[PDB]
Amino acid sequence: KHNMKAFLDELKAENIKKFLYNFTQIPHLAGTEQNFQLAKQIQSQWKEFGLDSVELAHYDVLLSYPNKTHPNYISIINEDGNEIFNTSLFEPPPPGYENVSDIVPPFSAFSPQGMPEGDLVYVNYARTEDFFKLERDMKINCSGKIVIARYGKVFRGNKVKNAQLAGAKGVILYSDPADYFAPGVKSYPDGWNLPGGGVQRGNILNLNGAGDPLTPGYPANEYAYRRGIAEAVGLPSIPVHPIGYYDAQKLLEKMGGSAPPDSSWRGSLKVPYNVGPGFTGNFSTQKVKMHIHSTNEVTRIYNVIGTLRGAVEPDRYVILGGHRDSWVFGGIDPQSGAAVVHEIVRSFGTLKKEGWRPRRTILFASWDAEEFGLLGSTEWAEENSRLLQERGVAYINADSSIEGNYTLRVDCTPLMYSLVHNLTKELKSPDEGFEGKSLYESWTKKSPSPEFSGMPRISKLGSGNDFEVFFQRLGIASGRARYTKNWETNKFSGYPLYHSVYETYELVEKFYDPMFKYHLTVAQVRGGMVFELANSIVLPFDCRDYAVVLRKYADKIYSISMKHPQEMKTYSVSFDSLFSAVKNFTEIASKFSERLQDFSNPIVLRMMNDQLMFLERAFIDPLGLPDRPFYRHVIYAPSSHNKYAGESFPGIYDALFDIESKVDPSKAWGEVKRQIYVAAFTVQAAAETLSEVA
Amino acid sequence: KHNMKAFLDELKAENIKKFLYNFTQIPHLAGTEQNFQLAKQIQSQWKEFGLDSVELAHYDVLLSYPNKTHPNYISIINEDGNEIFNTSLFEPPPPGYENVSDIVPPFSAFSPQGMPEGDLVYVNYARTEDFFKLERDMKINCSGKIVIARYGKVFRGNKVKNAQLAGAKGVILYSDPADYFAPGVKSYPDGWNLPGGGVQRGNILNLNGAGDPLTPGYPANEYAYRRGIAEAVGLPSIPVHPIGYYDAQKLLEKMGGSAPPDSSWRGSLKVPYNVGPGFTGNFSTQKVKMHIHSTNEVTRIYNVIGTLRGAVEPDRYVILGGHRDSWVFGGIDPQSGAAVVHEIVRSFGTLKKEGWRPRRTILFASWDAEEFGLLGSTEWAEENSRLLQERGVAYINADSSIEGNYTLRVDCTPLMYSLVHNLTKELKSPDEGFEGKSLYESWTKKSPSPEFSGMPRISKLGSGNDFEVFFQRLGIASGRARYTKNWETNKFSGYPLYHSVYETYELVEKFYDPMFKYHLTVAQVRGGMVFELANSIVLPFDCRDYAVVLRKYADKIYSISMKHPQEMKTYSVSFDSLFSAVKNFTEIASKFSERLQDFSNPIVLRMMNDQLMFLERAFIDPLGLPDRPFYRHVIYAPSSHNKYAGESFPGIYDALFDIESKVDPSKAWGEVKRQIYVAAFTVQAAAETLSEVA
Numbered sequence A, B: 001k002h003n004m005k006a007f008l009d010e011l012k013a014e015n016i017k018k019f020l021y022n023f024t025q026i027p028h029l030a031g032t033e034q035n036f037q038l039a040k041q042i043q044s045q046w047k048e049f050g051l052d053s054v055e056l057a058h059y060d061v062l063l064s065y066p067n068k069t070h071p072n073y074i075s076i077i078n079e080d081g082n083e084i085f086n087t088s089l090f091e092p093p094p095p096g097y098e099n100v101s102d103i104v105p106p107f108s109a110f111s112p113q114g115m116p117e118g119d120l121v122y123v124n125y126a127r128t129e130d131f132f133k134l135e136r137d138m139k140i141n142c143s144g145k146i147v148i149a150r151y152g153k154v155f156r157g158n159k160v161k162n163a164q165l166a167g168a169k170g171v172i173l174y175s176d177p178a179d180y181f182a183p184g185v186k187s188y189p190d191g192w193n194l195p196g197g198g199v200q201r202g203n204i205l206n207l208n209g210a211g212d213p214l215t216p217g218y219p220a221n222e223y224a225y226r227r228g229i230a231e232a233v234g235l236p237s238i239p240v241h242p243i244g245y246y247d248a249q250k251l252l253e254k255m256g257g258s259a260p261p262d263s264s265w266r267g268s269l270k271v272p273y274n275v276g277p278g279f280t281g282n283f284s285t286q287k288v289k290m291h292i293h294s295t296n297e298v299t300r301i302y303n304v305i306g307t308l309r310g311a312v313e314p315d316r317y318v319i320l321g322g323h324r325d326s327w328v329f330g331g332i333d334p335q336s337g338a339a340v341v342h343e344i345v346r347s348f349g350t351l352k353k354e355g356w357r358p359r360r361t362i363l364f365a366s367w368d369a370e371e372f373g374l375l376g377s378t379e380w381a382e383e384n385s386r387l388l389q390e391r392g393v394a395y396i397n398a399d400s401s402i403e404g405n406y407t408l409r410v411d412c413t414p415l416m417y418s419l420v421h422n423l424t425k426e427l428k429s430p431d432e433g434f435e436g437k438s439l440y441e442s443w444t445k446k447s448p449s450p451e452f453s454g455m456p457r458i459s460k461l462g463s464g465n466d467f468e469v470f471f472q473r474l475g476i477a478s479g480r481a482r483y484t485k486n487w488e489t490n491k492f493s494g495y496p497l498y499h500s501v502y503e504t505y506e507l508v509e510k511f512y513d514p515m516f517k518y519h520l521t522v523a524q525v526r527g528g529m530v531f532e533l534a535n536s537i538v539l540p541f542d543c544r545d546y547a548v549v550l551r552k553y554a555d556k557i558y559s560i561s562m563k564h565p566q567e568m569k570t571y572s573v574s575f576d577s578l579f580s581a582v583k584n585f586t587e588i589a590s591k592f593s594e595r596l597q598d599f600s601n602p603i604v605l606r607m608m609n610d611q612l613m614f615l616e617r618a619f620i621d622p623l624g625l626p627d628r629p630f631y632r633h634v635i636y637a638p639s640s641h642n643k644y645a646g647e648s649f650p651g652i653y654d655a656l657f658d659i660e661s662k663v664d665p666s667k668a669w670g671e672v673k674r675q676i677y678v679a680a681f682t683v684q685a686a687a688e689t690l691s692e693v694a
């Protein structure tokens, strides 16, 4: 038989290992020749594997690179202007790669050029609450200062935005061993920790879903008319550079001014973590000077798009996508995911060669320039938005398959919760001690739901990866799954060698997944989801699961507002409409589920599959969220303080945030009521798409 | 058999006559009790006629009414401040109706209150080119003046916008006999001309598709959060009032200053048509003073929505809609159309009672508050936008069925051209001298296509009626058809008694259509279109007709740009991408048509019916046109100078308009190139929806 078990059994750990090795021998930085060569290889192999069509889709987008003959670095200067300490110009390369060419040195992509010199202020993780603490409580003014912030907790672009709004003239990001050095494990190459010379690369854009900064709304094709740089979307206005903890220690050890306000501001280095501004008495006249000379350049990128045409509903698309570009070798990010995608295509192709086709069309994508702001996936979605919004069933992302070896981690729309629970109950756990138990059992034991008991945690989607345009802009049901660590406070910080030259094939093969069994489990989860989505007669979405979460999110946002009872009385702020809509959604979803279970009629089926497919679409508001026109989903958006985190009822959440500090409370509460109306209306409208059609 | 001929034969002129009489005995002004009573009657009758469900959908929207105890009027005052002439407080009521209550006096809906006093300037039709002539050529400054403008040629809201931007402090609109008195015909009640005391009511909003001024984007339901008046959409900033030509003659006869610049500025009254400013020597110290005391008030409105559920595709909707609210008795506008809709519902219901159902669902709508800015249709479309954009096949409008008795007039999307040509070839002409000939033959003879020879004229859709939200915002294929006059220069001015108290049942029965044969022909065209759209196995749209017009529109916009060859060289302005897209659209549409003709498979059928249904949808840009977010169609929009007229490639047209007057030509031409890119991309994207799906 050609069924899901056939598909799953064809997947092999050994093939994933071979592909990972093949994908990680040289750097594949977006916009480079090496990455174009890999694109061509994948295109050729996907054709050999059996896909119906495999094309490259190219775009010309804004990228950012250091200047090869004018290196970025930071100094401490003395009052004579002698640079008495300089940060490193490169990460010491790992063993056996000290002769690889074209390793990009650590830099913050899209930083402007500048040579700002000033006094340092230390701002902890540079989160919104860290800046509130500095400015409001400690009365420290960051205006005209250079801020130094540790990586972790929130997306680095949010740190930079926060530092800009505080009036900083530059930002230095560093990896503290508190966040990137697990106790008791050795530094690379002898273990999986970050060495003192290691540095995390990464972009510092605040695009809010726009894609290429020069062409918001439209694909960056050959005739595109581009914004000038001064009008580009999301570029930072102050220079930014990342460093390792050996270098950070040199900059932090001389810091004076105020003590850290409490222990949550102290990392693990042997320094006081004084917030500053500036250095202690003896060194009071020394300054810090940045030298950033990176350039932004429009550069061609290439997505590989493979199609496996559906036998019955070829005009319904299930998309499996993940990126191919890496900062350096991409041992985990992204090639651990791309190797999984490659073995999934191979397996589907093996069934295709035996005469099988999926019910619906499956599209496979190898995206480019994810690391520079989701540019490849977003431009392709802009180009194909009409096809996607009328035909897109689901998108499953496939970046890093592993960031640890402890248990599964899943983020997806509520419409896929039942699917994930059901699939993981049929898969074998790879974990030690759970031999012969299901993955559902191990995952549920290790990652219990905070609400539900006997169920696993599944989190909300925000941004940070290539599903963003499909879910937040277009309203296509989306999901993602990987193996992760047991390190809860670090869930947005990255694994220690994240975006460093040390993330290599050897890292994975030696320290993460020697038997490629966690990779295989992730291939079964991702590929199993795609199989069911593309093959199930009735789409495997359960609208009742959305009804349950909408009530939870309504309770949560009401509870936030209720911290302000006097204002709710004064301005007549009622959540009654939103609860009414949620109640209606629950009732209508229950009735739809009954019809779906109780309806030979392919029109009724597809009419009801269209109702299922367009349900996520119904949560899109074509006017977008306030000042974020490309985040259009009313139930979820990437958090305004941390793009990696999803926020629920984001329009109301943002209207309430720090509301006690707004100068015109009537106006501020008016905008809360407006967002409650938009949210109640959208919930009711989505519910009504599940009513009988006529 | 239950086929189109059965449907058409059931329609009766006598029933349309009976319904028109029934609908026009009392005023039905939006927001009044009388109009709610008519809504309830229609709802009851549609149920008796056989519809599956008939509901009222209500909204609370901003309307505008004169103050019953503080009348609006205009004076000439002398230097002592004595009002020496006053305009009328009401139109003399027609015979037999001099005792009807609640006839609203002439007023401009949504005018602000004010009592501005000043010198008059006469601005012809107050078109963009009339103000260019005054200001640029004649060097007459309208700042702080009261402008007096004749109705005609363009929507009155555009006149007011133009007068505001010229700095006018008030506007007086009047009906000149040149435009509203056909030579050789008598004034009402003895003929169909406007008497000197007759006055055209009408709103002066510039909503650009927003619907209710207080709730743009969302339905004005019970929990809606409303903008404050100061932030409302589209309200005029200066007082405005309409008058008849007896009154206009008193205001114009004393005008001095400059002679009219040419004969196209002179109407038919016995006055010089001096442009002013102000009065000739003897009366130089007299002024004109307006007194406007109308109030804007949030008021409940009611749409009637009837459903006839489809037998095979109940989740595909064909909509027949027209409004019910009238300024006074609505003898032509709208009840000549509503009586036609009523007989169409009756006929469909007669087939339904015999066991027939259409293939697709048909929705019937009696809209409210059309006269106050399309408010009923727009709020309902905002409420139901998700259902409409995923299920809406087509919208056929049904306002006034007759505005003359000469020949057919049609405006529709190119997707319906073949349908209209084919249907009119099967209908009998009602015209004298064409007994036994087709309506296609008479219409083609009387209204020849300017391009095509042997074909009739069909015009582009703009705004001015309830199809606007469905077509311009949502991208649902739309059409409209009525009987019209032979008076080409008057095609946007209205028939003489338009929006006056004189448009009565007797007007129609005596002077327009005594045998109700033109009404019946229009019922056959509108109802025949709905029948074919709701019943044809393959949707009756021909994508090749869009390809033909896109080439014509591309040629036209290129020709406008080519009036500026030096700038096109300097700024490298190329239309090559747009022509390429049109060429691709033509090729792909040809191939799709071949597959459609050459494809027992209901999946392929519906897959191809979905391709047909979503083709109009593909021309929507979710970012809208510049500063007009609710006009989203890239090929068509209501003209920025005349909302009644459609404009093609409106984004490029507006970027080119008066470009030689812009102070920063680099920026102005940059924006032309941007609009060419958006247009070429959208054409190509629409074409790609017709490619094989996988």
Ligand SMILES: *[C@@H]1O[C@H](CO)[C@@H](O[C@@H]2O[C@H](CO)[C@@H](O[C@@H]3O[C@H](CO)[C@@H](O)[C@H](O[C@H]4O[C@H](CO)[C@@H](O)[C@H](O)[C@@H]4O)[C@@H]3O)[C@H](O)[C@H]2NC(C)=O)[C@H](O)[C@H]1NC(C)=O
Pocket (backbone or CB within 6 Å): A577, A578, A580, A581, A584, A680, A681, A684, B222
């Ligand atoms: C959840 O679904 C329910 C349907 O099961 C839906 O209920 C609807 O609620 C609205 C708003 O409450 C009702 O609106 C009323 O409609 C009647 C006519 O049917 C009007 O007369 C009412 O207006 C009067 O009362 C108002 C409130 O006091 C006054 O402000 C107003 O000036 C009038 O005096 C009112 O508009 C509607 O009838 C029901 N529909 C039903 C029961 O079928 C509810 O709205 C849904 N929730 C959401 C968030 O959409």
Ligand SMILES: *[C@@H]1O[C@H](CO)[C@@H](O[C@@H]2O[C@H](CO)[C@@H](O[C@@H]3O[C@H](CO)[C@@H](O)[C@H](O[C@H]4O[C@H](CO)[C@@H](O)[C@H](O)[C@@H]4O)[C@@H]3O)[C@H](O)[C@H]2NC(C)=O)[C@H](O)[C@H]1NC(C)=O
Pocket (backbone or CB within 6 Å): A222, B577, B578, B580, B581, B584, B680, B681, B684
């Ligand atoms: C109408 O449909 C046709 C397809 O039948 C479609 O043609 C496409 O045109 C684009 C743009 O001209 C082609 O883009 C080229 O793609 C190749 C790789 O295939 C690139 O190497 C080319 O880039 C080079 O040349 C450029 C121009 O001189 C340089 O600016 C650039 O720096 C490179 O040196 C170029 O991107 C594309 O291949 C075809 N596709 C085909 C033939 O299948 C056309 O775009 C459609 N029209 C519209 C308006 O969409």
Ligand SMILES: O=C(N[C@@H](CCCCNC(=O)c1ccc(I)cc1)C(=O)O)N[C@@H](C[C@H]1CO1)C(=O)O
Pocket (backbone or CB within 6 Å): A202, A203, A333, A370, A371, A372, A373, A374, A399, A400, A409, A410, A411, A463, A464, A465, A480, A481, A482, A491, A492, A493, A494, A495, A644, A645
């Ligand atoms: O690196 C990226 N993404 C990593 C981020 C790893 C650190 C934070 N982790 C999460 O956000 C996360 C991981 C897994 C799951 I299931 C859910 C969330 C990833 O998604 O694997 N994306 C790049 C590009 C910019 C768009 O974010 C970056 O963040 O620098």
Ligand SMILES: O=C(N[C@@H](CCCCNC(=O)c1ccc(I)cc1)C(=O)O)N[C@@H](C[C@H]1CO1)C(=O)O
Pocket (backbone or CB within 6 Å): B202, B203, B333, B370, B371, B372, B373, B374, B399, B400, B409, B410, B411, B463, B464, B465, B480, B481, B482, B491, B492, B493, B494, B495, B644, B645
């Ligand atoms: O009166 C309205 N519509 C009339 C307008 C009649 C004069 C101008 N005629 C056209 O625009 C027209 C008529 C028929 C056809 I087929 C196409 C265009 C109608 O559509 O019949 N609408 C109202 C409401 C505001 C939204 O325009 C008005 O214009 O005051």
Ligand SMILES: *[C@@H]1O[C@H](CO)[C@@H](O[C@@H]2O[C@H](CO)[C@@H](O)[C@H](O)[C@H]2NC(C)=O)[C@H](O)[C@H]1NC(C)=O
Pocket (backbone or CB within 6 Å): A021, A022, A023, A025, A040, A041, A044, A045
């Ligand atoms: C990754 O695997 C690919 C595919 O096997 C290798 O590319 C092939 O290399 C052989 C030998 O040079 C050529 O004959 C083929 O034409 C290549 N096939 C392609 C590109 O589809 C590639 O050598 C491997 N890369 C590494 C680093 O091992």
Ligand SMILES: *[C@@H]1O[C@H](CO)[C@@H](O[C@@H]2O[C@H](CO)[C@@H](O)[C@H](O)[C@H]2NC(C)=O)[C@H](O)[C@H]1NC(C)=O
Pocket (backbone or CB within 6 Å): A075, A081, A082, A083, A084, A085, A086
């Ligand atoms: C840090 O690097 C800077 C820049 O290379 C060094 O300063 C330079 O030293 C050279 C050789 O002595 C001079 O010719 C340049 O003019 C200096 N440039 C600048 C910008 O100062 C500096 O010596 C280095 N500091 C340390 C401690 O290694």
Ligand SMILES: *[C@@H]1O[C@H](CO)[C@@H](O[C@@H]2O[C@H](CO)[C@@H](O)[C@H](O)[C@H]2NC(C)=O)[C@H](O)[C@H]1NC(C)=O
Pocket (backbone or CB within 6 Å): A418, A419, A422, A540, A541, A542, A597
């Ligand atoms: C997950 O599996 C459960 C258990 O099999 C599925 O729920 C059953 O579905 C069938 C078919 O509709 C019903 O007859 C049973 O009553 C259901 N059992 C329940 C609700 O306990 C569920 O459909 C699956 N979820 C998917 C496929 O998304």
Ligand SMILES: *[C@@H]1O[C@H](CO)[C@@H](O[C@@H]2O[C@H](CO)[C@@H](O)[C@H](O)[C@H]2NC(C)=O)[C@H](O)[C@H]1NC(C)=O
Pocket (backbone or CB within 6 Å): B021, B022, B023, B025, B040, B041, B044, B045
């Ligand atoms: C328009 O026609 C309607 C429907 O025939 C008339 O309303 C009916 O009037 C009779 C007699 O008063 C009542 O018994 C019915 O209940 C009404 N039916 C409805 C409202 O559905 C109405 O009288 C006519 N109007 C005019 C001006 O002639």
Ligand SMILES: *[C@@H]1O[C@H](CO)[C@@H](O[C@@H]2O[C@H](CO)[C@@H](O)[C@H](O)[C@H]2NC(C)=O)[C@H](O)[C@H]1NC(C)=O
Pocket (backbone or CB within 6 Å): B075, B081, B082, B083, B084, B085, B086
């Ligand atoms: C035009 O109407 C105005 C307003 O009614 C008339 O002026 C009023 O005349 C009455 C009675 O003589 C006075 O008591 C009011 O104070 C006047 N009001 C104003 C605002 O002036 C005026 O007489 C009328 N003119 C003509 C020619 O009929």
Ligand SMILES: *[C@@H]1O[C@H](CO)[C@@H](O[C@@H]2O[C@H](CO)[C@@H](O)[C@H](O)[C@H]2NC(C)=O)[C@H](O)[C@H]1NC(C)=O
Pocket (backbone or CB within 6 Å): B418, B419, B422, B540, B541, B542, B597
């Ligand atoms: C309008 O009528 C024409 C003439 O009947 C239709 O065109 C024919 O359609 C049939 C069925 O596809 C073809 O086999 C013929 O070759 C067509 N004749 C032509 C193109 O000259 C046309 O489809 C009708 N338009 C509609 C229904 O929208």
Ligand SMILES: *[C@@H]1O[C@H](CO)[C@@H](O)[C@H](O)[C@H]1NC(C)=O
Pocket (backbone or CB within 6 Å): A067, A068, A069, A070, A295
């Ligand atoms: C990089 O720097 C070198 C000199 O250090 C300079 O000549 C060149 O302009 C720069 N390259 C850029 C800005 O792309």
Ligand SMILES: *[C@@H]1O[C@H](CO)[C@@H](O)[C@H](O)[C@H]1NC(C)=O
Pocket (backbone or CB within 6 Å): A141, A142, A143, A144
């Ligand atoms: C911070 O310092 C800048 C620079 O002098 C000044 O303009 C700003 O007002 C200061 N703000 C606060 C809150 O002290």
Ligand SMILES: *[C@@H]1O[C@H](CO)[C@@H](O)[C@H](O)[C@H]1NC(C)=O
Pocket (backbone or CB within 6 Å): A192, A404, A405, A485, A511, A512
């Ligand atoms: C793999 O799991 C083991 C056993 O718990 C653990 O000691 C090791 O550190 C894990 N590797 C990684 C990278 O987490």
Ligand SMILES: *[C@@H]1O[C@H](CO)[C@@H](O)[C@H](O)[C@H]1NC(C)=O
Pocket (backbone or CB within 6 Å): B067, B068, B069, B070, B295
């Ligand atoms: C209408 O005018 C009368 C007096 O002329 C006044 O008392 C009332 O306030 C007005 N009505 C309004 C503004 O609705």
Ligand SMILES: *[C@@H]1O[C@H](CO)[C@@H](O)[C@H](O)[C@H]1NC(C)=O
Pocket (backbone or CB within 6 Å): B141, B142, B143, B144
């Ligand atoms: C028109 O008159 C006003 C009022 O004095 C003045 O401000 C404006 O500049 C004038 N414009 C022209 C073009 O004469």
Ligand SMILES: *[C@@H]1O[C@H](CO)[C@@H](O)[C@H](O)[C@H]1NC(C)=O
Pocket (backbone or CB within 6 Å): B192, B404, B405, B485, B511, B512
């Ligand atoms: C009806 O048609 C006749 C004959 O051409 C014409 O004289 C008459 O004026 C028409 N009525 C209207 C309202 O146009």
